[PDB]
């Protein structure tokens, strides 16, 4: 049993506001653990800064999943380099490659709240809400359970209601809404599932 010899895989970073960055990753292959993993360290620093990396400890014994961690308390509109390491009972393993990501210039809108209105054999009607302070528009996301996500871009000036048309009958669709801002796209709402009538 030794320290891991491989970096985490499938690293993905995305800034979710002026102060926060969402980091996703997967574990290294089983052949590079050398001892069951106890967790990870997520490293971050300002891109060119001479200061060293700051590491956040993320405990994750559960594996076979996509791990994610929300860095917070960051600086507005600045670029950071992000890495992730793995560790076990023995020492820490090697870090992943750097992903450089910039924080946003402002706060994103809150995730909307979606609710079902009605459903027919070929249509589904949906309401949503703001709980916002300035929103610039929305996007409605829908799919059939077995299919791929389709997108309906929308304007904030309209009524916050929409009716999907031309749908298959006796088919379960999933629906959710995202809000839009000058600074970017907010988190998604919860996914509404409903089946069309026969």
Author numbering: 389 to 521, 525 to 589
Reproduce text from the manuscript describing this model.
Recently, a shortened Dscam (sDscam) gene family with tandemly arrayed 5′ cassettes in Chelicerata species has been identified, which encodes ∼50–100 isoforms. Crystal structures and cell aggregation assays demonstrated that both α and β subfamilies of sDscam used Ig1 for the isoform-specific trans recognition in a hand-in-hand manner. Furthermore, the cis interactions were established by the three FNIII domains of sDscam, which assemble into a cross fold with a kink between FNIII2 and FNIII3.
Thus, this kink conformation may reflect a physiological geometric assembly. The inter-domain interface of the kink contains a salt bridge formed by R404 and D578, and the hydrophobic interaction mediated by L492 and L496.
